Amino acid sequence: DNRINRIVILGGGTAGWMTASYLAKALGDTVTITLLEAGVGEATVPNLQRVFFDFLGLREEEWMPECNAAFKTAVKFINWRTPGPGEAKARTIDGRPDHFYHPFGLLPEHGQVPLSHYWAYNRAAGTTDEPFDYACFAETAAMDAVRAPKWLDGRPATRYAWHFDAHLVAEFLRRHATERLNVEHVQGEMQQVLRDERGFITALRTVEGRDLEGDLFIDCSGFRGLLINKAMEEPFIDMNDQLLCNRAVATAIKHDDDAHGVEPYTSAIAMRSGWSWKIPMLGRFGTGYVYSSRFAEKDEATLDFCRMWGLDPENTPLNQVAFRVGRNRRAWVKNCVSIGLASCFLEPLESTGIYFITAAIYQLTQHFPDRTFALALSDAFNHEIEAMFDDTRDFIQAHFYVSPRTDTPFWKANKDLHLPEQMREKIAMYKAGLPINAPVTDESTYYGRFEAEFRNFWTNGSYYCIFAGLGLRPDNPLPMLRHRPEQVREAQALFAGVKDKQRELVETLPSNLEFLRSLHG
């Protein structure tokens, strides 16, 4: 009667085929879906399996071997506290290497107080100088030991996500969507966008003559935004005043994994005018220098990038990419919904690209319209997308704002940018000893249901991982702890349990290389 009958997806990369697969599984044979289609590594977050691949019925043992996928236990931040050149290895500060981890999972609590706050109490008490991540996360020792996140037979050990080749994932999903979910793939470019009297898109015209008619249209055309920006004329909110990076130079490097294994984490390596990612996979790693054009020249960044990896810049294939940092004013206008780069983009500092797509796809089915296109459905969708993006945007900027580096104009200028009021409050709260967005559920519920994580994506553990990782600690511990000395004494058993877990994980887990060879061999 009024149900959507036909959906047309413009764009055939990761965003397009994730959208085509998920909507085709959700809607079944009730909707015709057609996609019009005209690697330096990518990292993800743990919810990708339960929200996406589990929805499609795809076990990790099936889709991982077909995309050269590898495991991610954390993001490791390197040289964000010490001045110097852009180098792959961590510098030394206070006898330790200048690195810290941002693992997944939720911190345990004693007395409804996160473990981070007991670590901060012991740092203030002067009885320990251990870093926050090594005291509260057992995953830190495993990643140093380059362990897999699971035993070879599948026994679980630590919360993990995935590194993979985005092109191979897109091809896997295309072969899934077309062979199993009746999604129709159409080659060729888009000649014109047909609109009716109200401005709603009515069909996409190919260069051959074919109208791809539909009731709902999904813009997955990447930075080009052929539908949402060009056709629908929705303006883009440039946010590069707040996040200065807007360029990247990237490549693939073959890696002899038998020398030092395969790191089960994404690296984020501080540079003179930005930061470099390192995304390890079996036999090779993807890497890219993200920098600000306003502080480094193209050739400068290119040479800095090659110098860090010992690459010959004259005989090295390089991707030179310019970024659009920000989001559309509205992600969904009339019957056009933008997903992926067509909607918004942030530098991949905390690996939120696939998550932004997965979240936009989930929220789309939660607000799925009919041909009436009730304004409340797209308004509520746009608010969820807008709040999801701005929250992560402010979180990423705090990595630069809180870093103590002032040695280059770039690092120093980040301290001169306007700090958003809500992040100002979070830093003031953290300094007063308060938790920031402490988790209200256990880890099973958090990762079990997507709406629980969505409403609290960056928890207290994450703000402590970044703030304490960058050397910022509370002015004083949580004041109530000075009234609960028995809690402090009891909570120390939690630190001894982490040390117990660190010993057994290093001593019994297989290497990350061993698991990848079992999975891909």
State the catalytic residues: 72
Question: Does 111 appear as a known binding residue?
Answer: no
Residues 475-501: b if buried by 16+ CB within 10 A, e if exposed: eebbeebeeeeebbeebeebbeebeeb
- Verify binding: residue 350, ligand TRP, rule CB under 6 A: yes
Nearer to ligand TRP (CB atom), residue 132 or residue 457: 457
Question: Does 385 appear as a known binding residue?
Answer: no
Given a contact cutoff of 8 angstroms between Cβ atoms, the answer to whether 27 and 9 are in contact is no
| DSSP helix/strand/coil, 490 | helix
Dihedrals phi, psi of 336, to nearest 5 degrees:
-120, 120
The binding track of 296-335 with respect to ligand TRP, each residue x by CB under 6 A or -, is ----------------------------------------
384, 399, 393: which is closest to 454 by C-alpha? Answer: 384
Nearer to ligand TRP (CB atom), residue 221 or residue 460: 460
Smallest gap, in angstroms, from Cβ of residue 497 to ligand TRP? 20
| Region class of 496: left (phi > 0), else alpha (psi between -120 and 50), else beta | alpha
Q: Which of 139, 257, 347, 453 binds ligand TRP (CB under 6 A)?
A: 453
Neighbours of 231 (CB within 10 A): 22
Q: At 187, which amino acid appears? A: Q
Helix (H), strand (E) at residue 457: none
The binding track of 402-441 with respect to ligand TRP, each residue x by CB under 6 A or -, is ----------------------------------------
Given a contact cutoff of 8 angstroms between Cβ atoms, the answer to whether 288 and 319 are in contact is yes
Smallest gap, in angstroms, from Cβ of residue 403 to ligand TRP? 17
DSSP state of 25: H
What length does the chain have?
A: 521
Bridge partner residues of 201 (DSSP): 195
Binding part of the chain for ligand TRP, among 97-105, 183-191, 285-293, 421-429 by CB under 6 A, reads 97-105
| DSSP helix/strand/coil, 51 | helix
Three-state DSSP string of 35-46: EEECCCCEECCC
Binding part of the chain for ligand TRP, among 100-108, 148-156, 197-205, 209-217 by CB under 6 A, reads 100-108
Helix runs in 181-272, H state only: 257-260
- Verify binding: residue 102, ligand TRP, rule CB under 6 A: yes
- Verify binding: residue 347, ligand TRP, rule CB under 6 A: no
Q: Which of 351, 378, 397, 460 binds ligand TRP (CB under 6 A)?
A: 351
Q: Which of 11, 16, 39, 46 binds ligand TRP (CB under 6 A)?
A: 46
- Verify binding: residue 99, ligand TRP, rule CB under 6 A: no
| Burial status of residue 112 (CB atoms within 10 A of its CB: 0-12, 13-18, 19 or more) | exposed
- Verify binding: residue 104, ligand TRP, rule CB under 6 A: yes
Nearer to ligand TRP (CB atom), residue 219 or residue 350: 350
How crowded is the C-beta side of 474, counted as CA atoms within 13 Å?
A: 25
Nearer to ligand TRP (CB atom), residue 49 or residue 273: 49
Q: Which of 457, 464, 467, 515 binds ligand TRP (CB under 6 A)?
A: 457
User: Max Cα separation, the chain?
Assistant: 77
Smallest gap, in angstroms, from Cβ of residue 461 to ligand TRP? 7
- Verify binding: residue 45, ligand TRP, rule CB under 6 A: yes
Given a contact cutoff of 8 angstroms between Cβ atoms, the answer to whether 336 and 24 are in contact is no
The residue count for binding ligand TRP (CB under 6 A) is 11
Question: Does 359 appear as a known binding residue?
Answer: no
DSSP state of 313: G
- Verify binding: residue 35, ligand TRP, rule CB under 6 A: no
- Verify binding: residue 75, ligand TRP, rule CB under 6 A: yes
Question: Does 209 appear as a known binding residue?
Answer: no
Smallest gap, in angstroms, from Cβ of residue 181 to ligand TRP? 27
- Verify binding: residue 186, ligand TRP, rule CB under 6 A: no
Given a contact cutoff of 8 angstroms between Cβ atoms, the answer to whether 121 and 494 are in contact is no
Given a contact cutoff of 8 angstroms between Cβ atoms, the answer to whether 314 and 306 are in contact is no
Residue stretches of the annotated binding site for FAD: 12, 15, 38, 42-43, 190, 341, 353-354
Q: Which residues bind ligand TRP (CB under 6 A)?
A: 45-46, 75, 102-104, 350-351, 453, 457, 462
Show binding-site residues. 12, 15, 38, 42-43, 190, 341, 353-354
